[PDB]
């Protein structure tokens, strides 16, 4: 069998058949065709994989995957004395941070130099972001239709250092990559929710407490990928999500394999009834990793005494507690095998991603 089954990639496109849309497009942007970067809705089918792994991939693609945004270097926004009094640096910085960019190079630096030498309110569009850094853009990284602030008559706006910054969307939401559009379990029967007696329920026939779904359909939307290269961009995004998950799991694996040597991430107590308690404390870790670890440890040790994790919003850490009727090294090797199971599952996911999209 194969885990990640066939994918459905359908970009979002401007329907020029609508007269108003085409008229407006040609009137203000002189636009007659599809934009260079379009949002793509990627709907995926997953079979024979636990809900924790699919949701972890979704969460990573949402905000835990590294991503690029346009930021202004401090001192970039020329305070000056002619600049528009309404277009504050904070406002324009917020506008520019959230312009989705498909940047393959970090060295690109843009400059915004717009002057309103007329009596009308001039609107600064994303097409006004001219680029002066390194390689000339063979293909644009952002759409030229974004509305940046307007200029009052006689006013200007000069921002000279607009560079590309790397980060994850969990820390700053301007790095969020994939927006959720669908999530369902295909192996759980659903009630007809349009009925009155089942309208207050979720719809699934199995209670979430007693349900263990293995067949899921996951739908995600990526906000801007190049139009001619949609499939390769989707492949890269999914493969990078799998790589990120594997890398973090391996970071946990190092703490596991250092179990005899002292370390404050992992402690071990043999409490009363031959049971050994392992507490794994990792800082700046999300529910994705803790949920993956809990689910796979529980799958590998069905008779476990207790496995649980908690990412308290404060203390900004993931604390995973395992209690088992086994000695310290037996428990450690069970946990190592469970991590190897996680790595195997996500490597198989990357293999399927390579096989499918192409």
């Amino acid at each position: 069998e194969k885990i990640f089954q066939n994918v459905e990639i359908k970009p979002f496109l401007i329907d020029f058949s609508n007269l108003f849309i085409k008229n407006a497009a040609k009137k203000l942007f002189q636009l007659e065709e599809q934009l260079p970067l379009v949002p793509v809705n990627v709907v995926m089918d997953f079979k024979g994989i636990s809900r924790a792994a699919v949701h972890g991939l979704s969460r990573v693609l949402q905000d835990e995957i590294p991503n690029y945004m346009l930021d202004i270097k401090p001192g970039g926004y020329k305070i000056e004395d002619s600049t528009d009094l309404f277009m504050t640096e904070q406002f324009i910085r917020n506008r520019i941070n959230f312009i989705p960019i498909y940047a393959k190079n970090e060295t690109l630096v843009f400059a915004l130099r717009s002057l309103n030498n007329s009596c009308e309110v001039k609107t600064i569009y994303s097409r006004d972001l001219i680029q002066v850094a390194g390689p000339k853009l063979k293909y644009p990284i952002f759409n030229p239709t974004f509305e940046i602030g307007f200029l009052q008559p006689g006013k200007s706006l000069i921002i000279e250092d607009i560079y590309i910054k790397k980060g994850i969307g969990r820390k700053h939401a301007a790095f969020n990559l994939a927006v959720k559009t669908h999530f369902s379990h295909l192996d759980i029967e659903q009630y007809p929710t349009d009925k009155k007696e089942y309208m207050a329920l979720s719809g699934y026939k199995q209670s979430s407490m007693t349900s263990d779904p293995r067949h899921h359909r996951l739908g995600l939307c990526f906000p801007a990928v190049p139009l001619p290269h949609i499939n390769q961009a989707v492949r890269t995004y999914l493969k990078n999500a799998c790589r990120i998950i594997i890398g973090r799991i391996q970071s946990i694996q190092k703490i596991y394999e250092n179990f005899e040597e002292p370390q404050p991430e992992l402690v071990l107590f043999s409490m009363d009834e031959e049971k050994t308690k392992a507490i794994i404390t990792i800082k700046d870790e999300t529910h994705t990793i803790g949920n993956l670890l809990k689910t796979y440890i529980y799958e590998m040790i069905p008779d476990i005494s207790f496995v649980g994790y908690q990412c308290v919003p404060h203390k900004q850490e993931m604390v995973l507690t395992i209690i088992h009727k086994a000695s310290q090294e037996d428990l450690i090797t069970l946990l190592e095998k469970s991590i190897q199971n996680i790595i195997q599952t996500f490597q198989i996911l990357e293999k399927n991603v390579d096989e499918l999209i192409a």
Partner: peptide, 28 residues
């Protein structure tokens, strides 16, 4: 004297219409 005129609002109006025509440099 300048602080009496530079904070006078009609000077900003007079300045901003000179910038539109280009009679004065855009900056200060």
């Amino acid at each position: 004297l300048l602080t009496e005129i530079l904070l006078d609002p009609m000077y900003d109006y007079a300045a901003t219409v000179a910038r539109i025509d280009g009679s004065i440099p855009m900056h200060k």
